[PDB]
Amino acid sequence: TVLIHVSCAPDLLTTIFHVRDAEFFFYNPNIQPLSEYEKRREAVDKVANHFSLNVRYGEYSTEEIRKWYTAVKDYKDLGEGSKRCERCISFLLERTAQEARKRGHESFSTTLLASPRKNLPMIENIGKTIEEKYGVKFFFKNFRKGGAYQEGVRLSKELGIYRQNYCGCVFSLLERRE
Numbered sequence: 001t002v003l004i005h006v007s008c009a010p011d012l013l014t015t016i017f018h019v020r021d022a023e024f025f026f027y028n029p030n031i032q033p034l035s036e037y038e039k040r041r042e043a044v045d046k047v048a049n050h051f052s053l054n055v056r057y058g059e060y061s062t063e064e065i066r067k068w069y070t071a072v073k074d075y076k077d078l079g080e081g082s083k084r085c086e087r088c089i090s091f092l093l094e095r096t097a098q099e100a101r102k103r104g105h106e107s108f109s110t111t112l113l114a115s116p117r118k119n120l121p122m123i124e125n126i127g128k129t130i131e132e133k134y135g136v137k138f139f140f141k142n143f144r145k146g147g148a149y150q151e152g153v154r155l156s157k158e159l160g161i162y163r164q165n166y167c168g169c170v171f172s173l174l175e176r177r178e
C-alpha cells in the first residue's frame with residue numbers, strides 16, 4: 001500500500017486513473033488563505049465521495065502554516081520553480097513520508113506528479129531524497145502521461161469540481177497578479 005499526498009482535486013482525478021490501492025493524505029499548509037484551503041479540501045472530499053476513495057485530512061492551523069513559512073521564507077523573493085518551491089514540496093513530502101511510516105505504508109507518492117505546472121525531475125529528486133532519509137519507498141510515475149491530465153480535466157468538468165488558478169501560497173497569488 002502507498003500513501004499519496006493530495007495537492008488538489010484535479011491532480012487527484014488525474015492520479016486515480018493510474019493507481020488502485022492507495023490511501024490519500026490531504027496536507028497543504030502552503031495553501032492560503034483558509035477560505036481557499038477549505039474550498040480545495042471540499043473539492044477533494046467531493047471526488048473521494050464520488051469514487052469511494054480513502055482520504056485522510058492533515059493538520060491545518062496557525063502553527064502548521066507558521067512551520068511551512070519558516071521552511072520557505074529565506075527564498076520568498078525567488079520565483080516559482082526555484083529553491084522556494086523545492087523547500088515547499090520537500091516540507092509537504094517529508095510530512096507525507098512520516099505519515100506513511102506511522103500508518104504502516106511501505107511506499108509514498110504525491111499527486112503533484114500529475115500537475116502540468118510542476119517540475120517532474122525536481123519532484124523525483126525530492127521523493128528519492130526523502131526515501132533515503134526515512135526508508136519509505138518513493139513511488140514515481142509520470143501521472144500525466146497517457147494523456148491522463150486530459151482525463152482529469154474531463155472528469156473535473158463533469159463532476160463540477162473546482163479548478164484553481166494559482167499554485168496555493170501567498171507568493172503564487174502575488175505572481176498571478178504579476
Ligand code: SF4
Nearest residue numbers: 030085088167169172
Ligand atoms: S508556488 Fe506552489 S510549490 Fe512554490 S512555494 Fe508556493 S505553494 Fe509551494
